[model samples]
Target: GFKQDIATLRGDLRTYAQDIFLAFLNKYPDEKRNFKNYVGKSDQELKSMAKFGDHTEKVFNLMMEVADRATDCVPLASDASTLVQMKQHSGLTTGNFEKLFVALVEYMRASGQSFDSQSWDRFGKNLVSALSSAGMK
Candidate 1:
């Protein structure tokens, strides 16, 4: 049962992350320049830009860090028997999941030269609707 729940949560996380990424890209089209470069560059090259003097680079670094962290996160599996031996676990309350999601959205706006609060709100609402349709809530 625990394993099944973990699997469900993993699937949900994947969809949620994808939605967040797409919404971010839609809002900041210019940031695609940095995103494309970052994806193709060596880790060293990426790190160099992340640490450089440009504020845009700094924002990109923050966005990349969050995205990478989200991608690399793995859920631990527990057998039914092991579940009894462990403390109570509620998947929804774990980590900074919601906060991280919001931060990723905000990071996109901050990174873009065309920062608009209304656009961010609209994007967030759209993301919420997408998640809800997926049965997230």
Candidate 2:
């Protein structure tokens, strides 16, 4: 006898993964190669692993809804202003400031966790607290 519960959970997780990938793709189509590499899963393999026929499409739709309004969704850039601002604000020594800022941006980008409205609101509040603690204007 097949274990229905195990099958169901597996299906749900597979759907969730596909949803995340689709969200990433929608947000950064040009970075599809990077995303695939990071997830360590090919689109074809993911499709094959999906137990239900509508799994992929359903996940994609759900992802679209969640990904439509992400905060901090802007692409990271190495602008002069950003560099100057980081140096002026972060208080890191000149030699390490640029590297530290880049690392933090990259870490934030690569974290792979999606934030919904509620989470973003909390994130904004926490950011204000952090800035206040850091004495940032």
Candidate 3:
């Protein structure tokens, strides 16, 4: 069900996000700080930070909304609001965002959901395009 997919995407984001953050945080220490007030907390501690947990919910929800509305067929809409808000508020870079999606893909797969590689490929491309264009003076 469409509703079910949307609900799962938004609802399980706390675990999904913390998993992703932990998986990549050490790999990109500089990038990690972009998401929150980066103290030298342990992974478990970071996961429990209610405010950042809420931040994760918003971030993932926005991803779902943009994926549903903007990336339906892709080349993506020319409008930059999706890109703008994602870039500004997501506090994640293009590469980091791709990694986030990788975590999501794996997380869904573990739950027996079918998130395919083509979707990942397309989403990655479109997102980088948005980010690339975002820098135009």
Candidate 4:
């Protein structure tokens, strides 16, 4: 079910990636402060910046990759290394990604996208476990 859901979602990413990120910032404004490149910029302004789009694309790519392996989601060693370094730099805990995952679910739901809740739950659990295994607390 997650595989099917992700199949549909990956198609939507080209058009809705920015909206998904906007939904995250709207729902968790505190997270917006973490992006140094978007500092002092409004959403409208941020959207026009190359950095914003690049960042959103990177996030969407990671989401698609993880979704594709939803049943057994785990970041690749290289990805885990990068993620660990990013988390360390940002002082973010493992729980932050869980919150971000919820943001994605919220965005999808609000956009009238259908998905298997159970599948997402499993994906989220595996994702968190994967992160923890990568040395994140």
Per-residue lDDT value at 80 in model 2: 22
Question: How far in Å is the alpha carbon of 86 misplaced in model 1?
Answer: 28
The C-alpha stretches of model 1 lying farther than 4 A from their native spots are: 1-101
**Cα deviation of 6, candidate 3, in Å:** 5.0
Best candidate per TM-score, number?
A: 4
Candidate 3 steric clashes: 0
lDDT score of model 3? Answer: 0.60
Cα displacement (angstroms), candidate 3, residue 117, comes to 3.6
The per-prediction CA RMSD against the true structure, in angstroms, equals 15.5, 15.9, 4.0, 2.8
Error of 2 at 92 (Å): 21
Error of 2 at 4 (Å): 23
Ranking by TM-score: 4, 3, 1, 2
Candidate with top lDDT is 4
Quote the RMSD, in angstroms, for model 3: 4.0
What tens digits encode model 3's per-residue C-alpha lDDT throughout 53-84? 77766766666666666544243554434565
Model 2 is weakest, by summed lDDT over 10 consecutive residues, at 73-82
- Candidate 3 or 4, higher lDDT? 4
- Candidate 2 Cα RMSD after full superposition onto the native fold (Å): 15.9
- Give candidate 3 regions above 4 Å deviation: 1-7, 33-36, 71-80, 85-93, 96-99, 102-113
Residue pairs in collision within model 3: none
How many clashes in each structure? 0, 0, 0, 0
Q: Candidate 4 lDDT (Cα, whole model)?
A: 0.69
lDDT (C-alpha) at residue 121 in model 2: 34
